[PDB]
Design a protein around this ligand. Structure first.
Ligand SMILES: Cc1ncc(C[n+]2csc(CCOP(=O)(O)OP(=O)(O)O)c2C)c(N)n1
Ligand SMILES: Cc1ncc(C[n+]2csc(CCOP(=O)(O)OP(=O)(O)O)c2C)c(N)n1
Ligand SMILES: [Ca+2]
Ligand SMILES: [Ca+2]
Lengths: 667, 662
């Protein structure tokens, strides 16, 4: 078989799988098949029999709608993705969902589809490789050495996140990142010149990339020469400008928007087979074509050689090797749990009224020596988010460091960190003011969807930040996080809940954790040993009465102090009241029914929520017969103490609103 | 007097107001003061006595933390912003909040602070000027002719949204957009070379901008020559690369991150006065410096000249001039309410089972001839969002058109449309798949904060979109919109509710409206005249019983049919059941309490919400003793019919959950 025939196997499988599903995207797989054949057969270092090989190259499909391209590649090269699964493309519980999903499918590195985020993930994978190589490689022992290859299209280039992450990739001189741009002139509205006219090569040169122009994306020799050129440039990420024809092979739909996102149709597929000279029936591949596509023997040889290298490394550097293995597996140090509990107990015994952003920094300082896998950063807010600890070292200064200055790039930061978590070897944390979670919002969602461990440090969480005013004062952002599937969100009320939340976040293996942290100092609360242990249950009884409470206050973060003051006033008047601290609604909801009943008993309807955030959220825990002391508006520019008074976060107002339930549930 | 003395008045007012507040940002106002002095005194066309003059130039401070720069300029040039307000910078209910806010302060064009969005707004204002000029100017009568000037810094340049909107500005050849980049080498983390190394001039030339490099931002002659050159380039937006020193004037904090975001301190202010040669006490400005800065006399002359031009236009083009005035004031045509009601009544009388995305297109088609102020578009999804009507004309093809191909740029699109609404003259609508409201989320928030009218057309709203799978299937996005202050969100259940929602959106005067639209066909519900009129109240009784209900279903959008099916089953068993359709929770919540009680009586606790979105939202209406048939997870890639079954959107499950309450 010629290279074109081998590439046409991808075209056939893609158009036929889309046709059988009556759904999906034939255009990009057909347009990029020749590029994929050269990259995967001539360059990609991988082992289909072990998709988790630590030193494999990473491939990312940023134009993720072209999912049949990667399913064809994985199937043809010998991964555990049988033809039956391709026949079940886009069907319930198949290993071939409409967009590729990490975990669903052997060999898929990331979940893509939302445009722009795949190239961001690839930038994170390349940062991870560079940093891990710098931390672990030793003279004569280069155990980390692999490339990151990405495909992307016009949509990814138009998205702002491409600017964020490719600018930063240029700064960091990511010489093992090689991206292929599917320059096919077509997007969904039609010919892109009506809305997309950038000199993209010049733009990427402005970022410090090595750009290869005018590659014939349907000519294997041209593509191969370009990839060799990119691999020879070791000090810059490379962009290959690949001129392709969307839907290549279809006489009537190639080069048209009609090939982008719908089945070609059976008549058109017959004509496409005739144009391509592809004789085989749908889902039929001859043994000779598998023989040229299969990567099991080469892959075995390469991983075997790497294992020999790693064994030599382990003999010369046994502690480093043990750390590499631990970190690539995502395992925690064996003594971490005990040391973290010792830290938390020390805080509970030694009160300090500090901002929870400072309590967060103190937890980073405490955990940092125990977690060399941290790869942390802030989006140009290190002095405000308090993300640096004494052991931080920026990777633009020393590549073996552990800290990233992300610049003013919140979305790019968060999707890069998704790439860092997907790579293995690190535990990323990211940070910005909470308001600007809105800039990064879909990357946060994607971390949750992909079940990735990442700690998101979001500071300056309410009107408590004061004079900066309503553009920066969060109101509804925490509610948005709380209703996100698989998101964990903590709003700690003091330095002890802050440390507990950080411990929870770094030990959470199957999804991300957002910390909602104050600008201003928070009072430490008294806790018994039992209460201290109950912080991690998300919601717990902090103050109580004998018998059934007449009133339960539910409070979070900076408002627990206010709720406790109201509880004290009411208790002194002879009212039976309880205070529940709710640092994490998601962790509380995961507790069993008996525990939740013990904290929020169904008999007690007179519930008062107190939080400087949007009020409507709290109907979930207060019901229709309680009260909510919350925000219902945007904030205002003024000193924070005047804002808390103006918006009702006062002991007198909280007590008055509570007493209306002693007056209403009565009358 | 001397231009440096005149610029130093901005420096003094800025450092002193920050010091008095013990809060704020002296650095960028001190760094950009010489640029501002040249722009405002020599070029900017404006009238302090009427900040709403239709043909004024628009100025945007995208690096909005530098708010004392714009307050100093407004005060010095004679706007209604007295010295007492500058002395009340960042104080409760002052006219000088920490970031500039449109409406709070005479002369402020937009609310900035979130980096990158000011330049986006300015691109929108320049698109509005270009389009309005093409629509209204006539030979001998150029009634629209003004510039859009923007200041921006490193943070705006790093943000992705700058790439989206400046790319599109190049495509649209916005020759009256002129941006000044405060190239001062400093951001909050320190010297920017550790994280920001772009050849920014080369980047902007890649967008098709005219770029002027190596301007000395502290030399009036350098700056003035650059502005003249940019104004002579009429077929490209221009970027002026202005080298400045942050905190210019401060001997110990100039050129450092220490001048970015905190008071300089009293000692350092004294040293700064010495270095600048500024001899005036805090909040002292001599009469001659006001005389040199004041723009009232020239401004009134220019606006009067324009009024005379407009009067001549109105004599030659009376209908066009009346349209111009109406649109610039943001008024609706006087017969729009009646014509839209006639359309809605027609739909109710002529049932159709269509997707609410199609019903949306049909409302655009009906309203299009009535609302020439539409300036609509989609982020590369016209064939899916259905944003084109028969009279759509793309502005990249015809500058006098009414449609924008925004490309794959959801955040930039939304903030550009905020600029369009701020400009006056237009009613923007934007569109993408609902999932990607998450890419644009803070610009949506900013439309609400700024009380701007924009209709946001979000289609493909649930697991009903099918095989595309969980990256695209919305679950929690509608709940996020619903709890945003001043946002209106509509999830119509058929073509009639879709038209009512569109009417509500275009008739809003003080905020945005999000339409949550289905991929798939939705059955039309039968309605009495009273029900039909009550759609606009956001929640209404769609199916009822005699007497107090025993069970109330609350449903939205594509799930109303499912709730009606469950109602029919329970009604046939003899249950006193009701179905409430809730297309807009915010419109419902604004109703009088007797109305809300008539729909959701407080004595009836057996309430079942049905919506293919996140369940947690609905506790607001069902409380603790009801049921919610909603989503609690991400979606899955499969045909939509199978997903609705898999996730419990079945008559059997809805009926079972209801019977658990009875
Ligand atoms: C952030 C985001 N916005 C919108 C979409 C919907 N969408 C999918 S592909 C596409 C444009 C297709 O353009 P391109 O990447 O050039 O596709 P191709 O040439 O591969 O078909 C759009 C708008 C998306 N997937 N992600
Ligand atoms: C989207 C967004 N992210 C973060 C911030 C916080 N912030 C305010 S100013 C700034 C950096 C200031 O850098 P630059 O624009 O270069 O400021 P300057 O030189 O004018 O002081 C940051 C990160 C913000 N306002 N908006
Ligand atoms: Ca394309
Ligand atoms: Ca700067």
């Amino acid at each position: 078989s010629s290279r074109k025939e081998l590439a046409n196997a991808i075209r056939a499988l893609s158009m036929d799988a889309v046709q059988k599903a009556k759904s999906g995207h034939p255009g990009a797989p057909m347009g990029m098949a020749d590029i994929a054949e050269v990259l995967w057969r001539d360059f990609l270092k991988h082992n289909p029999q072990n998709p988790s090989w630590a030193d494999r190259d990473r491939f990312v499909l940023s134009n993720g709608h072209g999912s049949m391209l990667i399913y064809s590649l994985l199937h043809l090269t010998g991964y555990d993705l049988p033809m039956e699964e391709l026949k079940n493309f886009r069907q319930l519980h198949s290993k071939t969902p409409g967009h590729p999903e990490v975990g669903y499918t052997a060999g898929v590195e990331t979940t893509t589809g939302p445009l722009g985020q795949g190239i961001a993930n690839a930038v994170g994978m390349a940062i991870a490789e560079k940093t891990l190589a710098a931390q672990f490689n030793r003279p004569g022992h280069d155990i980390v050495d692999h490339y990151t290859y990405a495909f992307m299209g016009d949509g990814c280039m138009m998205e702002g996140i491409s600017h964020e992450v490719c600018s930063l990739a240029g700064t960091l001189k990511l010489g093992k990142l090689i991206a292929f741009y599917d320059d096919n002139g077509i997007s969904i509205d039609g010919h892109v010149e009506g809305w997309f006219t950038d000199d993209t090569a010049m733009r990427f040169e402005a970022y410090g990339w090595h750009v290869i122009r005018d590659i014939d994306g349907h000519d294997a020799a041209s593509i191969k020469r370009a990839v060799e050129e990119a691999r020879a440039v070791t000090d810059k990420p490379s962009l290959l400008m690949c001129k392709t024809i969307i839907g290549f092979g279809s006489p009537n739909k190639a080069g048209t928007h009609d090939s982008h996102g719908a089945p070609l149709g059976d008549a058109e597929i017959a004509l496409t087979r005739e144009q391509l000279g592809w004789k085989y029936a749908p889902f039929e591949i001859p043994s000779e074509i598998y023989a040229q596509w299969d990567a099991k023997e080469a892959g075995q040889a390469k991983e075997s050689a790497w294992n020999e290298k790693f064994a030599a490394y382990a003999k010369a550097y046994p502690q480093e090797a043990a750390e590499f293995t631990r970190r690539m597996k995502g395992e925690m140090p064996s003594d971490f749990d005990a040391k973290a509990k010792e830290f938390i107990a020390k805080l509970q015994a030694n009160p300090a009224k500090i901002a929870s952003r400072k309590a967060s920094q103190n937890a980073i300082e405490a955990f940092g020596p125990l977690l060399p896998e941290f790869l942390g950063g802030s989006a140009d807010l290190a002095p405000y988010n308090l993300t640096l600890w004494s052991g931080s070292k920026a990777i633009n200064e020393d590549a073996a460091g552990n800290y990233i200055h992300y610049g003013v790039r919140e979305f790019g930061m968060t999707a890069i960190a998704n790439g860092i978590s997907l790579h293995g070897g690190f535990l990323p944390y990211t940070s910005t003011f909470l308001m600007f979670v809105e800039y990064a919002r879909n990357a946060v969602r994607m971390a949750a969807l992909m079940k990735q461990r990442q700690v998101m440090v979001y500071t300056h969480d309410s009107i408590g930040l004061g004079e900066t005013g309503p553009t920066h004062q969060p109101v509804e952002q925490v509610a948005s996080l709380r209703v996100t599937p698989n998101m964990s969100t903590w709003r700690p009320c003091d330095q002890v809940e802050s440390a507990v939340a950080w411990k929870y976040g770094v030990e959470r293996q199957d999804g991300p954790t957002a910390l909602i942290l104050s600008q201003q100092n928070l009072a430490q609360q008294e806790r018994t040993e039992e209460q201290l242990a109950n912080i991690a249950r998300g919601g717990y009884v902090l103050k109580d009465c004998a018998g059934q409470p007449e009133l339960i206050f539910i409070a979070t973060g900076s408002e627990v102090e206010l709720a406790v003051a109201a509880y004290e006033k009411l208790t002194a008047e002879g009212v039976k009241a309880r205070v529940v601290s709710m640092p994490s609604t998601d962790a509380f909801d995961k507790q069993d029914a008996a525990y939740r009943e013990s904290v929020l008993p169904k008999a007690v309807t007179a519930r008062v929520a107190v939080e400087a955030g949007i009020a409507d959220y709290w109907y979930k825990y207060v019901g229709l017969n309680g009260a909510i002391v919350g925000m219902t508006t945007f904030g205002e520019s003024a000193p924070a103490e005047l804002l808390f008074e103006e918006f009702g976060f006062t002991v007198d107002n909280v007590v008055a609103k509570a007493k209306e339930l002693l007056h209403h549930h009565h009358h």
